[PDB]
Write an enzyme that holds these catalytic residues in place. Structure first.
Site, short mmCIF file in Angstrom:
data_model
loop_
_atom_site.label_atom_id
_atom_site.label_comp_id
_atom_site.label_asym_id
_atom_site.label_seq_id
_atom_site.Cartn_x
_atom_site.Cartn_y
_atom_site.Cartn_z
N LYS A 191 -0.52 -6.08 5.68
CA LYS A 191 -0.06 -6.18 5.45
C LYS A 191 1.57 -5.93 5.33
O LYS A 191 1.91 -5.04 6.58
CB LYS A 191 -0.14 -5.06 3.78
N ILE B 34 -3.85 -2.44 -3.00
CA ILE B 34 -4.41 -3.35 -3.28
C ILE B 34 -5.23 -4.62 -2.70
O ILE B 34 -4.90 -5.94 -1.72
CB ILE B 34 -3.86 -4.71 -4.21
N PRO C 170 1.19 -1.22 -0.52
CA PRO C 170 -0.05 0.37 -0.10
C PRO C 170 1.08 1.29 0.25
O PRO C 170 1.84 0.72 0.58
CB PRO C 170 -0.53 -0.53 1.26
CA CA Z 1 -0.81 -2.85 -1.64
#
Ligand code: CA
Ligand code: CA
Ligand code: CA
Ligand code: CA
Ligand code: CA
Ligand code: CA
Lengths: 103, 97, 109
Positions: free
Chosen positions: A33, A65, A1
């Site tokens: 993440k 994403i 990100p």
């Molecule tokens: Ca991402």
């Protein structure tokens, strides 16, 4: 990100590093993440008018994403806003963050 | 809405404030909302190549934007930048829509 | 198309002009559109953290009207990363690019 921040405050280098570090941790933790996927940018000293004044303000684009939604975006917004309140004295009413779930 | 502007002209503080105010008024009128809904950013002195030259140029991203408003809005901002900065080339992009 | 670049290192005007010119030629060739359609911006001196560190890094947004054909995004990414490697010594592992496929045209004047 990615989190791409813009503020009209000219931020000194130490405060900049603090914000980048705090935002890195917050984005990685709340979206879920690893930090190796997280990029933070701080565009400071960018003139901003908001609500007809040039009082301290900030704008952010948070792009991921997947991993966004009602259960995540509210926490990200509150957490990043508090970082800018404590580190830059920017009121949450003068910080707009746009979330985008990218294909 | 938020209008994030980039230009390769280095812009002085007064001209910057004038552009921000002019753009705030124009966006507010064209969209029909109070100024409390309008954020304008001006990233200046950002090198730009457009059509293979570094002549004066501007790039604008419109975020969180009535039909036809985008064309009248982008053209009005383009005119403001021409009048205030003598920028003859500009490009505007509706982002995240 | 538009390529909006951000990097955390300072970039002098001569190096900047080289990057802008080489990026213009590369984007025009890979996408197939004339240079008249290509805009490159270089925002330098922008603090960046990536993978928790502030070593030299860059972020790019490549905005195309309607998106690019299969494989073209990867070719663009590789080509831009080489420009940043050659001109700024930014390792390709620290270049992050996002592609925007705009469903509507730019407003140009
Ligand atoms: Ca991402
Ligand atoms: Ca959710
Ligand atoms: Ca807004
Ligand atoms: Ca419409
Ligand atoms: Ca184009
Ligand atoms: Ca295009």
């Amino acid at each position: 990100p990615t989190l791409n921040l813009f503020t009209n405050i000219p931020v000194d280098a130490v405060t900049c590093s603090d914000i980048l570090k705090d935002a890195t941790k917050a984005v990685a933790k709340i979206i879920g993440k690893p930090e190796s996927y997280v990029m933070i940018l701080l565009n400071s000293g960018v003139p901003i008018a908001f609500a007809g004044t040039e009082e301290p303000a900030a704008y952010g684009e948070l792009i991921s994403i997947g991993g966004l939604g009602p259960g995540v975006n509210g926490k990200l917004s509150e957490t990043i806003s508090e970082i800018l309140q404590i580190k830059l004295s920017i009121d949450s009413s003068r910080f707009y963050i746009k979330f985008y779930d990218s294909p």
